[PDB]
């Protein structure tokens, strides 16, 4: 048995190795009162008008006194097993600095007293769970969007693009374009409802001008959602105007390239001989690539940038929301993985420096 | 506002909230459902002696862990309860534990007032318990679908192994 | 032993803790002659043609020189025990200002010299004595009607509705619609008789138009009441035309919402996630919710306003007339409540400021 | 000659261009009877117990069958001139959607048959009438409060904050804190009197704790107001407890930031090089910034948030109540503005699409 | 309750309520004050023939438009009237038109009853007229300050160009 605790940007996924899906999915929030000392995860999302909300993984761990709270809430209150009897796999973002990879290993052995651990990369486990070892991985989470080109099982660090537009800034834009209709969502509990409208009713337009010109005359588009108190709100052309922010970031007012051009400027930054085996192997993951019609829009927009003799292929697996977690649940439930781990005795004879040697 | 919780209650809560490495004999002695009551002089919340469901008694004497939990509760008196629920959502398979405040409409007012004022004194000591559920009438707890209504509403698809 | 003195809007309820019902029930009146200096309670209701009647709790205490009279009449002349040997629980209305909660504590310790006291909220003790800690409390008294939504044992102060239509304005309307028949009730002693017709013979119509159209042809409706001098007055369709003022306040000429719409506009003013556990837990109290057929009319009229997927449930307990008092008689007769009280030594070392700290 | 009709959130201001102040100031209300068909403006404020009141500009126009009534009442019954002989400037709120800007132009040319029109932005005309083209505009009206940062004559749309706390929710809070004293204001005609107590006797406390601690012992604070029937009500510490809701919205029970922090979170959302020329040029407008001591409180509270080397300056012009209207009365009375307008012939050759081209 | 208003009255009201583009000759032929009376057989409200003040006659023959309006009204008979008021408030300069029901205490009862029952029949046809003002005694209309009392109370600062 082994615990797999994915250190998400906006959702901590955690479960036991060998399961198909994580047991615990909860926000990466530590909330403190404005004037119990700290509320963690779903408790700080439930309370209203009294808390100030902080994120310790707002994709690189910023605050280690808040991150210890998040992990204490994962083992005891959500997984429901003691950490000193279970080995604990963890995950880190691409481009994580070397000092942050040692402090993540020191907390598991000194604070939580784990018997063994391991730390993997979030982009590599997404590519291995699409049956590939070479391919560019679009990992679009809640708080950060990465393009990681991987050639033969090793991510190329100078070519890793990072876009700061991600699915959290689509929630806080969907509260603006539904305020245009008249639905004045503004509270913390009315942000979770907008985030659940986003999952169930948004989709990416194949062409934005011909869809928005069809949105005036057609009645097929308009949907009806039912709120927690049974009121019915009617969403119209805000279904495709929200995830189109990922392809045109000028809607949310930033000058950054879209996800069809940070993908292209990450293939062009790789060596000349390996670009053809990255054009034909775009692999997607994370919660924000779950929209329908986004594999059909990424293929169209990259093909318009890329030269004409190259084969552009976007691979979207159907369980890509949790592919970083599912890849760490297969790999830690292997019976031949039992000597791969970093044991507590190897920490006692080499300190935090062990993590670079065995979790490369 | 009055009553304190006994330290034998907190030991029963720590046997349910954090489970740990167990022999196949001892994992059949964990508690699936526990009822907490009040002592004879009404100063302390205690664990009620012979009203509990063990995990090892499921599938044999107890056919279903939820239908045999509704039958524990007295219909003319009030109780706290604590139920370890097993539910599968659309995307994920979960397991969380539910605090039930049972206070039927047929109970006397000296047993309905004294638990409503003492609920905050036993909830504070139960760290990390997410699902509170006050229940009054039998009809609100008897059906299987009304537990899955509090747990996820419309996203629960299988509660205690049975589909909804 | 402990005294429980409920500071009623039109009836002071007072008794000893552990009894099922209050020993003393008397009006909240101080009467003074037009030209003994002041008559209190039943004395000012008995005298005629010579007194001007004042109310100090006309639900928030207005006059503290008249309220000291009311409480002096409760301890000595009605309870019949000295206050310096008995601890004294008191009650206050929802939305009572912070200065009025300190002056209520200063009078008990400095004027009456109580050994200990406590002050509770009238809406919270009504909800705890229906076996709930979450639910909207319709508290319809003599002089004021409150809707107090309570979530997890704490009343939400921005959502507390207050309607100024209450059971006192139904007495002064029943003297008008029995003047239509010819029974010229006009004196002070002929107002108490109209108030006793109201208790024994009024009921809420399930549908007003089909009941009033049945009232012309049917002989079942018409009742006969016997006055203190043995005369027999015959009341007809003024049985359901009187408490229908609570559901249509345009009868008594005010533009205010009825008690089936101030209840709804107090659930809609609460946060979106908790409204479903207020729709299914309406709890009633006070003397003016005692009419038969009012739990069956509140369910019908709120269901016609509320959205269709929400479960509307009205809970009427059978002893709801004194549920604020009975809840304070159980809670002060507990043996484990003995350290909850505010003692006289805690007043001497912290002044009136102690009441906020220990009677929250 | 030209008409300038400001489409207010709670007060339609309208007059002829070249005048110093609007001829017509009336509420944005259409009232309909519960069971003439519709009453508009002051007629629906005068009638009592029979009307249900609706707002079509409750700052973005919601109902176009009610907004046609409001404008029909402005031209004929209040301005007193026929619209087909006079060109008509109009104003729109910041963040008004593109479809609502075309329907506003279609009604003027097809229903009212104007010879020419123009549509301006309410925040830009407030900044130009303080002698600036760069500066953050706090526009606090009756129903909505905007912070619009403007750099070189163009409002930055991603940085425009909108707070839903505004001067209408201070009237409905002043009826609660004067109910604490005993003045039971509750009717529609007793809401206009509370709204006139608010204009003449409220002020913003420089420090709330030292003013409210002075309010217990001092006799300088307490004022006396005289009602329409000659009765005298005495207002105390409800003079500064009412507009302090704008700086602490937890009093009215919402979790939103105050107007000293929605101003700060609108400067921080603008580009890094232009924030110093927004800190030193805060400009205020609208009816709800008219309180005395609010330019001295906004400077204190923004300085406590902002870094210490930045110069915080709040500019309050003395005629800021009507600065959006006065700026449209100067600009439409210019003799060189006569070719700026959208003529009826330009509508006939380009439809509603003309408004984007010439009213940018 | 009886009398109807003649269609020559409604034409005079539409010349006052909505003004329109006018030559300097024609804007001096708009009406500042008009008196409406009853016909000889008392079936219809008519415009009275030679009791009216024009806008063009102000500043010459009529020195002041309000002092020369009080002198039109008969002291032994009743009238409706219609006065286009010019008033400046504290913050704004306004112009609205006032419906005056003149019915003195020295008039006979057959001329006091027949206008009080016919007032609702001529008010309904006057759309959008805000300021109703019944007047009985001379002393209530004669002073300039008692018009500004009905119009704004204490917020009027200049009525017909003269300060109050
Ligand atoms: N079906 C869906 N459609 C669109 N967005 C979704 C969907 N499901 C989840 N999301 C979003 O994905 C984000 C969470 O993705 P995740 O990969 O877990 O992020 P992270 O690992 O950065 O915490 C949230 O913003 C969530 O709203
Ligand atoms: N059976 C009854 N039916 C209707 N009204 C009743 C009944 N019994 C009492 N009342 C009324 O209830 C009011 C007193 O209720 P109470 O809750 O004691 O008020 P308060 O606490 O505001 O003094 C009086 O107006 C009384 O006439
Ligand atoms: N002197 C004043 N002090 C405080 N509030 C005022 C004052 N004068 C007007 N107001 C308020 O300002 C609001 C109207 O402002 P306005 O800018 O016209 O709003 P809108 O344009 O949103 O209709 C009303 O709530 C009114 O009570
Ligand atoms: Mg992720
Ligand atoms: Mg009461
Ligand atoms: Mg405005």
Numbering used by the authors:
A (entry chain B), C (entry chain D), D (entry chain C): 6 to 40, 50 to 72, 74 to 375
B (entry chain I), E (entry chain J): 3 to 166
What does the paper say about this structure?
In the present study, via cryo-electron microscopy (cryo-EM) we obtain a 3.8 Å resolution cofilactin structure reconstructed from chicken cofilin and chicken skeletal muscle actin. A single bound Mg2+ ion and ADP (without density for a γ-phosphate) were clearly visualized, indicating that cofilactin was bound to ADP and not to ATP under the experimental conditions. All of the main chains were traced without ambiguity except for actin residues 1–6 (N-terminus), 41–49 (DNaseI-binding loop, D-loop) and cofilin residues 1–2 (N-terminus), indicating disorder or large fluctuations in these regions. Cofilin interacts with two adjacent actin subunits in a single strand. The helical pitch was shortened (Δϕ = 36°, where Δϕ is the helical rotation angle between two adjacent subunits on one strand) relative to the canonical actin filament (Δϕ ∼ 27°), which is consistent with previous results. Here, the actin protomer in the cofilactin structure is designated as “C-form” actin. The conformational transition from G-form to C-form actin is described by a 6.0° rotation of the OD relative to the ID around a new axis, designated as the “G/C axis” (orange in Fig. 2e), which is orthogonal to the G/F axis. During this transition, the inner domain (ID, subdomains 3 and 4) and subdomain 1 (SD1) of the actin subunit act as two independent rigid bodies. Only a few weak interactions between the ODs of the two subunits were observed. The structure of the ID–ID interface is essentially identical in cofilactin and F-actin (blue in Fig. 3a, b); however, the OD–ID interactions are almost lost in cofilactin because of the conformational change in the actin subunit structure. The number of interstrand interactions is also decreased in the cofilactin filament relative to F-actin.
